[PDB]
Amino acid sequence: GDKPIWEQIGSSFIQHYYQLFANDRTQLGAIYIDASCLTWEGQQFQGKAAIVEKLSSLPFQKIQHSITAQDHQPTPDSCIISMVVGQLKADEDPIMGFHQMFLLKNINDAWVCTNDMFRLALHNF
Amino acid sequence: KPIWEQIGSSFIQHYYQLFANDRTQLGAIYIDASCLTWEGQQFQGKAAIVEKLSSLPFQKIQHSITAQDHQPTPDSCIISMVVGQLKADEDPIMGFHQMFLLKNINDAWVCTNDMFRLALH
């Protein structure tokens, strides 16, 4: 009846994910199920624990994000797959591009992340 | 090499080899209920999707992957995400991002979800 549900749920996940990413990373566990999977700069991590942990150790202090584009589509298995392209500035590190992906699933009547992929857009020299 | 990587890599090679050579046959890696979001525009169904890709205003588009990540999901699917460069005819080289959600239907891996984005230098 207007803006697709997967586009409401998705942008709403993105929003909540990044905010939490900038205020208290040790709280990300709640948006992932136990059988989750994360890929950070080529590196894969399985299970909730190993994910939260990995994210808790990133050497950054202040981080900011600017969602430049975000695409959402429903999948055959009744899931929501999202693609994010944007930019971030980590402390006084130079502004850089990046892309992320999320696969949300409805569990306990709440949408939770099962798959997550992140990778900085490396400058070419 | 993890099995999910073998499937995904083999799929993107097949996908970009078709995309560079014969775009009109790109239907071979989609299903009728496939969905594509290109530069923000959505094309639902194999018919729409192929027609969109097939008619892009150019004779040849090359694609070079700068990096590719793959991953398996709880419900037997595979997510492939690429970041690389492409060049349409004589047009200048441009960055892009692309993600594919794969599933095995009819005993064959096919793409059900496809999102593409051009890089903003």
Curated annotation (Swiss-Prot), chain A:
InterPro entries: NTF2 (IPR045875), NTF2-like_dom_sf (IPR032710), NTF2_dom (IPR002075), Nuclear_transport_factor_2_euk (IPR018222). Keywords: Acetylation, Cytoplasm, Membrane, mRNA transport, Nuclear pore complex, Nucleus, Protein transport, Translocation, Transport. The keyword Cytoplasm applies. Changing residue 63 to Q: No effect on homodimerization. Loss of interaction with GDP-bound RAN. Decreased interaction with nucleoporins and localization to the nuclear pore complex. Its main location: cytoplasm. Residues 9-120 form the NTF2 domain. Changing residue 117 to E: Loss of homodimerization. Decreased interaction with GDP-bound RAN. Decreased interaction with nucleoporins. Decreased localization to the nuclear pore complex. The modification N6-acetyllysine is found at residue 3. One of its GO terms (molecular function) is identical protein binding. It is found in: Cytoplasm, Cytosol; Nucleus outer membrane; Nucleus, Nuclear pore complex; Nucleus inner membrane. Coiled coil: none annotated. The keyword Protease does not apply. Gene3D superfamilies: 3.10.450.50. It comes from the Eukaryota. Changing residue 41 to K: Loss of interaction with GDP-bound RAN. No effect on interaction with nucleoporins. Loss of GDP-bound RAN and other proteins nuclear import. GO terms for cellular component: cytosol; nuclear inner membrane; nuclear membrane; nuclear outer membrane; nuclear pore central transport channel; nucleoplasm. One of its GO terms (biological process) is protein localization to nuclear pore. It holds the Pfam family NTF2. Mediates the import of GDP-bound RAN from the cytoplasm into the nucleus which is essential for the function of RAN in cargo receptor-mediated nucleocytoplasmic transport. Thereby, plays indirectly a more general role in cargo receptor-mediated nucleocytoplasmic transport. Interacts with GDP-bound RAN in the cytosol, recruits it to the nuclear pore complex via its interaction with nucleoporins and promotes its nuclear import. Homodimer. Interacts with RAN (GDP-bound form); the interaction is direct and regulates RAN nuclear import. Interacts with the nucleoporins NUP54, NUP58 and NUP62 (via FG repeats); recruits NUTF2 to the nuclear pore complex a step required for NUTF2-mediated GDP-bound RAN nuclear import. Interacts with CAPG; mediates its nuclear import. This is Nuclear transport factor 2.
